[PDB]
């Protein structure tokens, strides 16, 4: 649920920026326009590492697929980091360092 609840609980804050706008005969989102307007020096467009399309995505399920994927990869990470937090809670005292 930590993964499946990420997008739904973030949608209220980012939906307003996904409204479509027309810029010089081209479709652009409000978020894309905001990023394009307020110039960042060392942040080109090509590095965005976002969903740029793919030939075996089957439409209308990109977000459900991603949310589930983060859902169970979290279980591995949750397990590892729970035990890492256990280790960081150690009271062991070593004789010499």
């Amino acid at each position: 649920g930590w993964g499946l609840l990420f997008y739904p609980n973030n949608w209220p804050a980012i939906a307003a920026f996904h409204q479509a706008t027309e810029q010089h005969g081209q479709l652009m989102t409000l978020a894309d326009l905001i990023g394009f307007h307020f110039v960042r020096t060392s942040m080109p467009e090509y590095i965005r590492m976002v969903e740029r399309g793919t030939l075996r995505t089957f439409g209308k399920d990109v977000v459900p697929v991603a949310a589930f994927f983060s859902g169970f990869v979290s279980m591995m990470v949750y397990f590892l980091w729970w035990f890492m937090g256990r280790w960081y809670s150690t009271t062991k005292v070593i004789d010499t360092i």
């Binding site: 209220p12 804050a13 939906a15 010089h24 479709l27 894309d32 020096t41 080109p44 090509y46």
Partner: protein, 388 residues
């Protein structure tokens, strides 16, 4: 503004900026200024810098002091990454808009995917007015107009701050109901069951149900508003159309073709005695008038009688030694060019000795008796002259 620290041979052998102009030097808030120019992609693209096959046009400025309303390169609107072909020339133009009062140094900049930033000429822009008077504004597909300076921030606050408050309230509730030391001692004394046990679990489940309800209600409510949204638009653009006039080295039946046959740069110093084999190839008597290395316009004093309008830190009106002799037409001869100006050392191009490839690059500009200008790409190894 940090182009001085970049390596010299990479600066002069990746992009050759020319015809760079700033529409206005002093601008007001909400007033539009256009930064345009042409860029030549060096034929001998360095191995260190990746191919310009994926690149982005940008305005080099200290933050969003000027809002970019639109930018074009290769006769295309380019809000996303574009492809630059090696050896071609491209025309770019950026429509800026004043946002922050002050004096800012605004550069023309292109970023290569595997190379990094390439900084072109920069000019000081004076901006007058107040920040609070700034409005973009932009229009939506439905026809409504919004102000990107303030739009959407209220909704983001109204969704984020209440949840942070809820989390803080949850933490403080569990901290005051059960103390830290008290609950730790309780757990350590074996009884880690009277520290947390229903009715505590009932409070937890009530909180979870309310949170899920708010998330579902919030998701549904924000779906009634903005019922038609689109995903982020991303991806490399279609191939650009290079410049074809006149030339624009590499285009047209009439063009100068130059080849470097050795050079000498005084280290430390400011001289660059380069031997250039000029084939002129064209029809009108041509005389060398300008050498743009990394944007630095070294203009030949004779041809360039009037000093042009260009940022002083790059405009060097002392690109001396051409031949004082029109070379064209049809004649292939070797001329000696003696680039010498303090800017060559200021912009720190004299640091070519520190680089791992002692090679120069840039554009050579030849002019007719009339105003016709012919561009030629020059580049090759040069030899340092170690002065004591």
């Amino acid at each position: 503004h940090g182009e001085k620290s970049q390596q010299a041979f990479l600066r002069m052998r990746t992009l050759n900026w020319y015809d760079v102009q700033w529409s206005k030097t002093t601008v007001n808030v909400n007033e539009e200024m256009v930064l345009s120019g042409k860029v030549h992609v060096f034929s001998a693209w360095p191995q260190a810098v990746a191919n310009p096959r994926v690149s982005f046009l940008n305005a080099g400025e200290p933050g969003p002091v000027l809002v970019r309303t639109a930018q074009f390169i290769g006769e295309q609107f380019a809000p996303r990454s574009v492809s630059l072909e090696i050896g071609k020339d491209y025309a770019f133009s950026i429509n800026l808009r004043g946002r922050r009062a002050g004096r800012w140094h605004v550069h023309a900049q292109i970023n290569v995917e595997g190379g990094g930033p390439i900084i072109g000429p920069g000019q000081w822009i004076e901006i007058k007015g107040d920040m609070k008077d700034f409005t973009d504004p932009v229009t939506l597909l439905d026809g409504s107009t919004v102000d990107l300076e303030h739009y959407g921030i209220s909704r983001v606050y109204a969704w984020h701050l209440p949840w942070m408050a809820v989390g803080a309230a949850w933490i403080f509730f569990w901290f005051v109901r059960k103390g830290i030391i008290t609950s730790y001692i309780r757990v350590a004394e074996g009884k880690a069951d009277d520290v947390i046990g229903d009715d505590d679990r009932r409070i937890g489940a009530i909180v979870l149900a309310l949170t899920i309800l708010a998330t579902i209600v919030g998701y549904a409510v924000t779906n009634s508003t903005f019922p038609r949204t689109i995903p982020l638009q991303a991806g490399l653009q279609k191939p650009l159309t290079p410049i074809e006039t006149e030339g624009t080295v590499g285009v047209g039946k009439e063009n100068v073709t130059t080849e470097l046959n050795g050079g000498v740069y005084k280290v430390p110093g400011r001289e660059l005695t380069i031997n250039v084999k000029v084939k002129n190839n064209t029809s009108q008597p041509l005389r060398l008038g300008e050498y743009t290395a990394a944007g630095l316009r070294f203009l030949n004093p004779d041809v360039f009688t009037t000093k042009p309008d260009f940022p002083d830190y790059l405009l060097a009106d002392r690109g001396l030694s051409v031949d004082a002799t029109p070379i064209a037409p049809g004649e292939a001869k070797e001329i000696v060019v003696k680039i010498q100006d303090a800017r060559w050392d200021i912009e720190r191009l004299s640091d070519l000795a520190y680089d791992t490839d002692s090679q120069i690059g840039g554009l050579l500009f030849f002019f007719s008796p009339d105003g016709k200008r012919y561009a030629s790409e020059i580049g090759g190894p040069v030899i340092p002259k170690f002065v004591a």
